[PDB]
Amino acid sequence: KPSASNLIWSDEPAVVVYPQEDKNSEGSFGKYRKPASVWEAEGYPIGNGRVGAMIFSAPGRERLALNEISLWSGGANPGGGYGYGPDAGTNQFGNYLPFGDLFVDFKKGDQPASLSVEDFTRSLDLRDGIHKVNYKADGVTYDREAFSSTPANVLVLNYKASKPGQFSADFSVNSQLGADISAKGSVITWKGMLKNGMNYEGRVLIRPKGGTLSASGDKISVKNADSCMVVIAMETDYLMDYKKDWKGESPSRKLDRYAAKAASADYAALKQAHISQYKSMFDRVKVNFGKTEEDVAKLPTPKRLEAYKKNPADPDLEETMFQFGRYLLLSSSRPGTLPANLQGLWNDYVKPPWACDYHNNINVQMAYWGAEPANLSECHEALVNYVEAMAPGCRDASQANKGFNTKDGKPVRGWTVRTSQNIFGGNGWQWNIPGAAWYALHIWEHYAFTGDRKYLEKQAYPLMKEICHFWEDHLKELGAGGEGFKTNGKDPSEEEKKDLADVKAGTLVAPNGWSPAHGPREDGVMHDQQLIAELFSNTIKAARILGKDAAWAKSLEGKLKRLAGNKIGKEGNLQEWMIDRIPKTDHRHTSHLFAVFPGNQISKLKTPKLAEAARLSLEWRGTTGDSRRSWTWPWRTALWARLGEGNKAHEMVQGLLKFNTLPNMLTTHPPMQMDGNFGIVGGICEMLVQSHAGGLDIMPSPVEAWPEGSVKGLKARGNVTVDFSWKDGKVSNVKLYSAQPKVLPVRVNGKMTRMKTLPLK
């Protein structure tokens, strides 16, 4: 019997096509028409934070769409444009690129093997992070295994058979970038230099047991082998340092230091080291939402999803969805490497949607919503190190914009970002003015969840203060009654001026802001005011914790108190602008709800009137049309949970699975966008534990779809690990762990208590 959770599998062979459309037969496409549709829905991903593959397993052929997180076109992009493509130069924005493909054409003898076999299954086992394939043919049981090893820093494949000498396959390497491919001995090497100057090189090392190996052309033929281990190594010359012009040691020199050593190891030792390392991150969080009926839990993932759309009652599938997001984050974000982009690190497009880049409008943030609460804190370091490394480029583009100039005609202090960012300090497309403030929330929350004072002083606080310096220069002061208020560049009408009657002189507002996705360009947009208030408050807290800059922090506290705050509209909704406009109930964005999540300003415990207004705004929002996005469901899940609506929050988990989830459990915008997989981790975490409103809140509101369950290993602010179970309407077995003894205010079962922490194990 198959596992009811933590296992994504299918009894149907994956559709195997070349990414180049003209290279496939019509039969090879299956039900699809485009090779990008095949890639996003059929592949199973593996990764170790730097190298990964989307796996397409079939009895006759196998495709591994390879990736290295640093393979990027483009460059500094001084013009601030959004041009990309595989030939984008240093003057263009660029995009994440596919490293290549490994095609395995299995053979019986000298003829191709059968395409249909018996009892075929392909599986991605989240319990050990291994892609597994199994089938039978002519009385022989074949088995394949694949994973991305962190300790070995390579991809490891292994093909076995129940009878000796029954493995034969042809290994070839495909490239969409015109790479120079050559096969000599037992290694296929492909390499190239992008138009922007970055060098890359990959190597496929073939290590069979028995049989004969031959390198004919640019392929390698294995015949009548007992088994076969394959090692895939990929490097670029990228270095996350602007001072070195983003160039480090050559990829060939790096591969010469470990690639052959990994291929010389015994496969059982590589797999043992991978499983041990992988479980050290995956097993940190265990969760159980209930039991699914065995008739449903035995279905393969594509059929189980179709069953979910008709009957969305599958707690074990939702646990798989939750853990899959943790799996994907740990497989694409590690300290020392680049952060996860729009698609984690998996991409076969030469020209991807939105350049598969770093979108700071929400996607990159969402990618790391579950990093802290789901106990993957070191994955968050990739984002902070990246924001710090990209900062010199952001200062260049920010200071070059005269629209940011201060009142004295001088360039602005600090920096902010455009909507899109690459890995060379380049910024693309429109300006995202409060974007750097959003990064500062992530910068702070990493300290808030770990208590790492060294991190706060050495890296976090210097970045936060600089981002504060930008807003000290850019903030605009309004007179009494909002004298200088401007909307769309023009003064307020007589009716609009009535909403500004209570505006006190000296009020600070973000000038000429924009509430994401609609509305006029207008001062004091709630979205911007909430982000800046969160930035000033967290920076003042960091200064106090560090005992630093007492005079400046005292001044920033003054400015914080003068920032235009939230208002409740005449209809009871939380206002989105300083102008009490009619609620945009048909809109898919709730940008003025940032203060509820991921911001920490509005809460039912501390601000009950504002929280009721925010709940009204969300209640009047629909879940149809363009609201069915990969990023809408997880944001709305966390919002409903923080407003005390566990049932409404669970309905957004159902919506993500019903309308924006592919048969391989990857979330789709459309097309495939991993922000849904990432963000739903943070959303479900808020349904279980909240630690932002002055203490621990254990399951603040019940979830009728989860009548009985338990969780272990969730993280709370203050570096506290939380374990508990629940049955009926009550929570029991609450255990709090920390490195040092602590007493926390804990709200549980509708009662406010204080609890002591136990020693962490």
Author numbering: 25 to 785
Could you pull the original sentences from the published paper?
We discover FucOB from the mucin-degrading bacteria Akkermansia muciniphila as an α-1,2-fucosidase able to hydrolyze Type I, Type II, Type III and Type V H antigens to obtain the afucosylated Bombay phenotype in vitro. A close inspection of the crystal structure revealed that FucOB crystallized as a monomer comprising three domains from the N- to the C-terminus: (i) a β-sandwich domain (residues 25–260), (ii) an (α/α)6 helical barrel catalytic domain (residues 357–712) and (iii) a second β-sandwich domain (residues 713–785). FucOB as well as other members of the GH95 family follow a single displacement inverting catalytic mechanism.
A conserved glutamic acid (E541 in FucOB) acts as a general acid catalyst. Mutation of E541 by alanine completely abolished the hydrolytic activity of the enzyme (see below). To further understand the FucOB substrate specificity at the molecular level, we performed co-crystallization experiments with (i) wild-type FucOB and (ii) the catalytically inactive variant FucOBE541A, both in the presence of V Type H blood group antigen as the substrate. Despite many efforts, we could not crystallize FucOB or FucOBE541A in the presence of the substrate or the corresponding product. The structural comparison of FucOB and the FucOBE541A revealed that the protein structure is mostly preserved and that there are no substantial conformational changes (r.m.s.d. of 0.477 Å for 761 residues). The crystal packing analysis of FucOB and FucOBE541A structures reveals a strong π–π stacking interaction between W453 with two prolines residues, P765 and P783, of the neighbor protomer. To determine whether FucOB can convert universal O into a rare Bombay type blood group, type O RBCs were incubated with 200, 50, 5, 0.5, 0.05, and 0.005 µg mL−1 of either FucOB or the catalytically inactive version of the enzyme FucOBE541A, and analyzed by agglutination assays against naturally containing anti-H Bombay serum (see the “Methods” section). In contrast, the catalytically inactive FucOBE541A showed a clear agglutination reaction after treatment with the anti-H lectin.
